[PDB]
Amino acid sequence: TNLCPFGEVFNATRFASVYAWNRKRISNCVADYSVLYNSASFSTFKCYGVSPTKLNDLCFTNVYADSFVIRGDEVRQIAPGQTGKIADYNYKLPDDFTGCVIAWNSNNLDSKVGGNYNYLYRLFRKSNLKPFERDISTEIYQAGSTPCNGVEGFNCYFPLQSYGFQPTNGVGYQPYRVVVLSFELLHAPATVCGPK
């Protein structure tokens, strides 16, 4: 009777900024990937490790739904072994990643005339992110030899930048919503399964 809350993540009125990517843990329910597997809304649906066919007959002790927004021409950075500002300083997938990356254009949802500057990404970080690491720090990034003391200026930069989604933008610069389904399983009893 209990179905898993994939609508809460996919149909959410908001997504998080990629640097503050949101994660919902999915435990102790029956998840059918039927709705998602065959759906006319998505423009990316790549699965690693698992095949998307078998999705509704294989299982895991938990699944994580990671929600965020980026622009389309960076959606291919949401993949194992890839590089770029999103993969390096916002959201990193592991090399052994078993799960599905789903993405769809959301220009009538997250762009607005004059621009929506609520969706940010981190463009400055001292080191690359580890897989599934999240950095919310907003401390001024020191690019020079002299410290910043929380003041921006030359060689002292705010580490985040807004996307500025406008509906007139080209499709590569349009906002795309992305759900990363991480299938985790250990030898605890499997708690999230499918219609079988």
Partner: antibody, heavy 119, light 110 residues
Framework: EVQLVESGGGLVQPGGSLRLSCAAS????????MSWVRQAPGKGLEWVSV???????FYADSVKGRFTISRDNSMNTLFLQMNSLRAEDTAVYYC?????????????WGQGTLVTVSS | DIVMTQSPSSLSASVGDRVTITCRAS??????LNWYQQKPGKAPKLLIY???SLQSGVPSRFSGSGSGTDFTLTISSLQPEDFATYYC???????????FGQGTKLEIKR
């Protein structure tokens, strides 16, 4: 004050190697986006390579598999190691600090070092 | 890869004149376009970033405008030290694949 000083350029035989250095003062190269840009004699600017603060590298398709960009933080220096140099690689090579806040733009350039490859 | 075509390729103008250089992109690059100035034997100097924003320390007579495919760099009063070659450069892609125009050489008439 900030400056970038290039060195290591000179004559290299076709197919040979050479390591260009760019010493920085002001910004620390380890924490910056850095790039190498080349300019063939009398012609225009061509992007060569870029290194991210986190270590990620990117190369133009002319130079992939032959050029590698690297850093020394102690020395505060950027390096461009070039192997199997071709005649077309003859150019002035500039190092430049790159800022990512409005796309990527190069706000301070090195002042070039000339690499001539011929037999 | 995106192609930047500058117009004209060479230009001559008098001290005090208004000068306009155009940069056209093969694809839409929004405002990810920068303008650099290179004097002979010297390092290129950044003049304009984000299509219309002026780099600090650059005289106010330099200014840039445009968006999408077409952009213009204008100098409102030309002066003798502005003889140079001017390059536009696009930064549209999320991953680095920058390209430059082929430069406009600006010579002084006297």
């Amino acid at each position: 004050e900030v400056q970038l000083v290039e060195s290591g350029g000179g004559l290299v035989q076709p197919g040979g190697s050479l390591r260009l250095s760019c010493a920085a003062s002001g910004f620390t190269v380890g924490w910056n986006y850095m790039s190498w840009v080349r300019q063939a004699p009398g012609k225009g600017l061509e992007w060569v390579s870029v290194i991210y603060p986190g270590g990620t590298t990117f190369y133009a398709d002319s130079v992939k598999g032959r050029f590698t960009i690297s850093r020394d933080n102690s020395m505060n220096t950027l390096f461009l190691q070039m192997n199997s140099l071709r005649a077309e690689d003859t150019a002035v090579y500039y190092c430049a600090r790159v800022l990512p806040m409005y796309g990527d733009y190069l706000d301070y350039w090195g002042q070039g070092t000339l690499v001539t490859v011929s037999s | 890869d995106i192609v930047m075509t500058q117009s004209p390729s060479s230009l001559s103008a008098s001290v005090g004149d208004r000068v306009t250089i155009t940069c056209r992109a093969s694809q839409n690059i929004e405002r990810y376009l920068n303008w650099y100035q290179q004097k002979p034997g010297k390092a290129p100097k950044l003049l304009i970033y984000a299509a219309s924003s002026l780099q600090s320390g650059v005289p106010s007579r330099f200014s840039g405008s445009g968006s999408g495919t077409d952009f213009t760099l204008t100098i409102s009063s030309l002066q003798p030290e502005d003889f140079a070659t001017y390059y536009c450069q696009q930064s549209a892609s999320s991953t680095p694949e920058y390209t430059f125009g082929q430069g406009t050489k600006l010579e002084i008439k006297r």
